[PDB]
């Protein structure tokens, strides 16, 4: 019973590999050889946000390119004003361990997730005048890793129990559940149209998930080690993954294979966060070895190095307009690079 | 218009800074423990005597301690363990004695010890089920000799002190497991973080004082590292 199914799965994988080899008409590097190089990029630190006590695990920019949300392991969720280095909001979290934070596109709600397995959503309307828990969500057995706002009433969330959830914030119950993963789901990235999203996970595969259908349309397996973070190209047709094998990979949904691998021989340390720019020409990746690298997407070369963090850069975020880049590391500092 | 918004924002910044400077003393004074242990090992007895994560809040000698017990979590530990580098100590509680559980415990301790981001976090080590191990070795079943070959060609260390009422075979097994953990801890030989092994009974009140003294030694050695004396 098991043999006729495992051999059938191996045959289907071989058919997918043969279809990918048949559709591999050329390489991105070969056609992008005749492209003018970006060159060395110098980014200066313009602001430095110093409010956190413990390590800053994750961050998420706002859609107005003005306010940023940063979560720390001490139990503090801080909403920062990037321009003036002023702390707009301080929230004391019930659970100290928080692995993610997200800011709603409207801006009313901020969500945090952690080892407590409960996602806490806070309303910033403040009719009372004090920040209070709008809702707490407890549907995941595994450790909660990533959450992102689709809108005011729906939130896509990632957990360690090999499941991705879509939660209706008004009801407080999961709208749908995604069960395709065989490994811990490290992160997810929402596309700008919001029809689809991508989940990077510890099973060395990245999954394209359809929100309405509830199943994974595409599976990408180009990574040797755990995929720590995932982000979208601005058009929404491609995505980049940072993994522990010190390689960044750009995958195309329509091509259904790995377009490009970014790697360097000296850099053996892991990758913690990736994020594109507004145009997509520059890929910004926060590596384990105490620096961030700016990569030319077309030419697969290192445009720049941002060595502004003494400790490992846990999270990297890029504004929607593209004006600034904010990097959060485990030395309790936030660095803004322009 | 801009001046009023800047004023209000500066006042909010001042209030938040005052809140963070009142919480900074609390965060730096209160020390943190990660109670990691196998399911066979009695960490439930530990959280009785001493959601996803469980929390025990207490204080000894006007020193605040929070101990965090892993609750309902997936067996894949390789990502969330990185979050626990910031805690002052990882208390690792194993059972000494069906499936083999000592070797998996040794491998898990090796994984904790050799982690590059756990080279500054010290491990306090609890060897539980001393009475159960004594009953097993007195029963005449050579479970430890079958599981570990070195135990047969093993001599009890002279510096080690035997508790009264204990067979020399019991002490030989106890200090043999202690030397297994010592060899795993000393194989790296980095010296940045130290492991303290303490035998613990099924019912004992000394464990809180042992954790207090071990955390004293951890903080003192970390300060000595800062002063470059050690």
């Amino acid at each position, epitope marked *: 019973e098991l043999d006729q199914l495992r051999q059938e799965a191996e045959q289907l994988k071989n058919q997918i590999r043969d279809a990918r080899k048949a559709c591999a008409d050329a390489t991105l590097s070969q056609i992008t050889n005749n492209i003018d190089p970006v060159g060395r990029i110098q980014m200066r630190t313009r602001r430095t946000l110093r409010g956190h006590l413990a390590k800053i695990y994750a961050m998420h920019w706002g859609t107005d390119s003005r306010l940023l949300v940063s979560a720390s392991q001490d139990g503090k969720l801080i909403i920062w004003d990037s321009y003036t280095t002023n702390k707009v909001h301080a929230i004391p979290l019930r659970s100290s361990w928080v692995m993610t934070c997200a800011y709603a596109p409207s801006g009313n709600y901020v969500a945090c997730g952690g080892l407590d397995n409960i996602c806490s959503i806070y309303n910033l309307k403040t009719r009372e005048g004090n920040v209070r828990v709008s809702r707490e969500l407890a549907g995941h057995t595994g450790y909660l890793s990533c959450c992102r706002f689709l809108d005011d009433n729906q939130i896509v969330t990632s957990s360690g129990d090999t499941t991705c959830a879509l939660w209706d914030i008004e009801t407080g119950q999961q709208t749908t559940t995604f069960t395709g993963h065989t490994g811990d789901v490290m992160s997810l990235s929402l596309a700008p149209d919001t029809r689809l999203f991508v989940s990077g996970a510890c099973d060395a595969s990245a999954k394209l998930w359809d929100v309405r259908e509830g199943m994974c349309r595409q599976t990408f397996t180009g990574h*040797e080690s755990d995929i720590n973070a995932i982000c979208f190209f601005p058009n929404g047709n491609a995505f980049a993954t940072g993994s*522990d*094998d010190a390689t960044c990979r750009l995958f195309d949904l329509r091509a259904d294979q790995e377009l490009m691998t970014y790697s360097h021989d000296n850099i*053996i340390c892991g990758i913690t966060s990736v994020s594109f720019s507004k145009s997509g020409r520059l890929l910004l990746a926060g590596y384990d070895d105490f620096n961030c690298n700016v990569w030319d997407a077309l030419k697969a070369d290192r445009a720049g190095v941002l060595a502004g963090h003494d400790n490992r850069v846990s999270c990297l975020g890029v504004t929607d307009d593209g004006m600034a880049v904010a990097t959060g590391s485990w030395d309790s500092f936030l660095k803004i690079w322009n | 218009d801009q001046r009023n918004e800047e004023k209000a924002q500066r006042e909010a910044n001042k209030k938040i800074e005052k809140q963070l400077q009142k919480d900074k003393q609390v965060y730096r004074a209160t020390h943190r423990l990660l109670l990691l242990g196998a399911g066979e090992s009695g960490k439930n007895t530990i959280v009785k005597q001493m959601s996803g994560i469980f929390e025990t809040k207490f204080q000894v000698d006007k020193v605040n301690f929070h101990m965090f017990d892993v609750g309902a979590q997936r067996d894949e530990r390789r990502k969330w363990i990185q979050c626990f580098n910031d805690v002052t100590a990882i208390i690792f509680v194993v059972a000494s004695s069906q499936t083999n559980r000592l*070797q998996a415990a040794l491998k898990l301790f090796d*994984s904790i010890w050799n*982690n590059k981001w756990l080279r500054d976090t010290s491990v306090i080590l609890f060897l539980n089920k001393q009475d159960l191990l004594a009953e097993k070795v007195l029963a005449g079943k050579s479970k430890i000799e079958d599981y570990f070959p070195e135990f047969a060609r093993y001599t009890t260390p002279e510096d080690a002190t035997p508790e009264p009422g204990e067979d020399p075979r019991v002490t030989r097994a106890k200090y043999f497991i202690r030397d297994e953990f010592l060899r795993i801890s000393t194989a790296s030989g980095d010296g940045r973080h130290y492991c303290y092994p303490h035998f613990t009974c099924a019912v004992d009140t000394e464990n809180i004082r042992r954790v207090f003294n071990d955390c004293r030694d951890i903080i003192q050695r970390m300060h000595l590292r800062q002063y470059e004396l050690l």
Partner: nanobody
Amino acid sequence: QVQLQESGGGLVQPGGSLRLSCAASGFTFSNYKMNWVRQAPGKGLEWVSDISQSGASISYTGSVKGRFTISRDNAKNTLYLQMNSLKPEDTAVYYCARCPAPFTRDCFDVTSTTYAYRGQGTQVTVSS
């Protein structure tokens, strides 16, 4: 795609000898520490033996220490396990597992049920 393919096994007699192979496809084989896990029928996963990146550091489970020989071939990309002086208590399903990260000493969750970086396994039975 990271894939591991165990080879060899079967029904064998005690006191005999047996060779196992692990075809490692889809990753840079030279940079990963790897190891063996076994599952006894009706029991949980327990660690067997390991081998580092270069192959200098080698360790075994005590119950099979001195009885197994692990060796990795980075040129031909295959992990080789030699098993002599077999025991009836050593019948199990064998898993050739890879440690998750490159250039790291620590193999955190190699011995867990739903771990995704191990092969499908092979059946080894020792009945007289």
